[PDB]
């Protein structure tokens, strides 16, 4: 992984030693080059994972998550450089440094062999993310959003640290390859119930699980666009990636410990989908849409079937591009009208025709139109939960109806109807904004031609 870690680190001197007016050009060009080389991780084998060294490994789960992570950095830079234009030079370079450092922590997090190394980088991501929200958010509520984000995470993560250290004492290793062979079954006792909770709750909060999700709508409504993109696209998936790995050592106790969380997720996805129908803030609507989508991922991980694990992987990747695209779409309106209220600016299709097309394509992926990888992921989870229990189809089917209604309600409210008369500063879509939207949707749809690369190890 040194061929990715080191060039990522080099982006920092690159940004700091650039000419004043070339910080965005240089950082964007070379982060795109790093993303190109990330495709070399597709050397996956049917039986063995790609095991580089004693520290780092990559398998079919972490590979698509790595490529998404390295793809997002250039997109984030493009998305940020307009609202940061008036910032002074040193504070721009600091902002870019936080983005680079987040990428560095993330690629190491998704490839760490040892669970305690994973924990430390898993936790290091809080610092740049918190700094980005509270320093470069626009509103007073960003300070409170930072605190909710910080302490929800640490409330669950500190128990995880104790559980992991306890496991290493008992088993002798936290190396994931070792744990695949030395894993022992988990017996019923109150000790193991709390071991199970300590091992899972930190990941549930990050997904987020319904009931522990209140931090998320705060964090998005307050974060700057780049903070929203990485928060939605990648940082939520730390929780999903965490469970997909740690559930290896929690069987067979997951048979019954999953029940409370499957119920919260199955009911939660309907509650949070219904909430989207009455949201007045466009960014808050997109944030609540993430909670509903990640509820499926939690259910998929908890029922532990080959089909559910494949659907969970595809869903995490697909939601990453869709949700980040939706935040970018909402931000482009915000840069003109400087408000997140959905009903403020309407009929925008009349004024911005091509942008309305990006809105349509993002909506259709959000509601999982076949054969998008959004639909592939959701369908695989639906297929596997039906085998878990036939009645889940009622809840899963109802959530599909609600998802269409709010996905198209958002499209109809902002794009259709009559334009607002007094909003006369809707300038034409910039080339930068159009390129930003295409760099989301084009790879998303191209993946429909070869879905296997985003289906994970169980493929």
């Amino acid at each position: 992984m040194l061929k990715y870690i080191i060039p990522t680190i080099m982006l920092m001197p690159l940004t700091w030693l650039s000419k004043n007016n070339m910080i965005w050009v240089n950082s964007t060009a070379h982060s795109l080059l790093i993303s190109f080389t990330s495709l070399l991780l597709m050397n996956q084998f049917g039986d063995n994972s790609l095991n580089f060294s004693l520290l780092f490994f990559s398998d079919s789960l972490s590979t698509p998550l790595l490529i998404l992570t390295m793809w997002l950095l250039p997109l984030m830079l493009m998305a940020s450089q307009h609202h940061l234009s008036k910032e002074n030079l040193t504070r721009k370079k600091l902002f870019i440094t936080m983005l680079i450092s987040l990428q560095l922590f993330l690629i190491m997090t998704f490839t760490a062999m040892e669970l305690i190394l994973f924990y430390i980088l898993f936790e290091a991501t809080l610092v740049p993310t918190l700094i980005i929200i509270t320093r470069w958010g626009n509103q007073t509520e960003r300070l409170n959003a930072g605190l909710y984000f910080l302490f929800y995470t640490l409330a669950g993560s500190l128990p995880l640290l104790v559980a992991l250290i306890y496991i290493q004492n008992t088993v002798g290793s936290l190396n994931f390859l070792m744990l695949q062979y030395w894993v022992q079954p988990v017996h019923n006792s109150w000790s193991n119930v709390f071991m199970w909770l300590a091992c899972m709750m930190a990941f549930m909060v990050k997904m987020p699980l319904y009931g522990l999700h209140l931090w998320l709508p705060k964090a998005h409504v307050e974060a700057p666009i780049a903070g929203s993109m990485v928060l939605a696209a990648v940082l939520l998936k730390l929780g999903g990636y965490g469970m997909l790995r740690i559930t290896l050592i929690l069987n067979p106790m997951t048979d019954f410990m999953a029940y409370p969380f499957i119920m919260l997720s199955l009911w939660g996805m309907i509650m949070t989908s219904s909430i989207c129908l009455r949201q007045t803030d466009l960014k808050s609507l997109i944030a609540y849409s993430s909670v509903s989508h990640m509820a499926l991922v939690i259910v998929a991980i908890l029922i532990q079937t080959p089909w559910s694990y494949m659907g969970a992987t595809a869903l995490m990747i697909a939601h990453g591009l869709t949700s980040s695209m939706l935040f970018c779409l909402a931000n482009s309106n915000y840069e003109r009208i400087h408000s997140r209220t959905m009903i403020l600016a309407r009929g925008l299709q009349t004024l911005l025709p091509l942008m309305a097309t990006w809105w349509l394509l993002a909506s259709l992926t959000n509601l999982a139109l076949p054969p998008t990888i959004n639909l592939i992921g959701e369908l695989f989870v639906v297929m596997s939960t039906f085998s878990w229990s036939n009645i889940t189809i009622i809840l899963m089917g109802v959530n599909m109806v609600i998802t269409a209604l709010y996905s198209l309600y958002m499209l109809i409210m902002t794009q259709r109807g009559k334009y607002t008369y007094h909003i006369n500063n809707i300038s034409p879509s910039f080339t930068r904004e159009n390129a930003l939207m295409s760099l989301h949707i084009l790879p998303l749809l191209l993946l429909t031609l070869n879905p296997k690369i985003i289906l994970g190890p169980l493929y």
């Binding site: 079954p185 069987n251 067979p252 048979d255 029922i303 532990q304 079937t305 085998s387």
Partner: protein, 112 residues
């Protein structure tokens, strides 16, 4: 020994390489200290006082090398003590009789 940083018996161990990655990191920390020294005193961060920046790296590396020597020696002593104790008390560390998975019974827990 007694109140000795590196006892004479530590000289039987291979010294840390001068290209040790941990020693490189220690040198890097010294370089970062040199830059912060420039920054807090509002000097040109990268260019000011290269003589001062050189000594920051050298001082960190010099101390870091001896700290790394003591670190490796202590871990060598931990292993030495452990193995000698395992030998002294063979009754407490018997060789476990190993069975193959064909003989060992493991309950099966279906996921259905």
């Amino acid at each position: 020994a007694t109140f000795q940083f590196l006892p004479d018996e530590a000289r039987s161990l291979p010294p840390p390489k001068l290209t040790d990655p941990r020693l490189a990191f220690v040198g890097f920390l010294g370089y970062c200290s040199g830059l912060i020294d420039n920054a807090i005193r509002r000097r040109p961060v990268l260019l000011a006082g290269l003589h001062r920046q050189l000594l920051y790296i050298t001082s960190f590396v010099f101390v870091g090398y001896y700290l790394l020597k003591r670190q490796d020696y202590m871990y060598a002593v931990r292993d030495h003590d452990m193995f000698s104790y395992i030998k002294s008390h063979p009754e407490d560390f018997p060789e476990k009789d190993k069975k193959t998975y064909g003989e060992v019974f493991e309950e099966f827990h279906p996921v259905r």
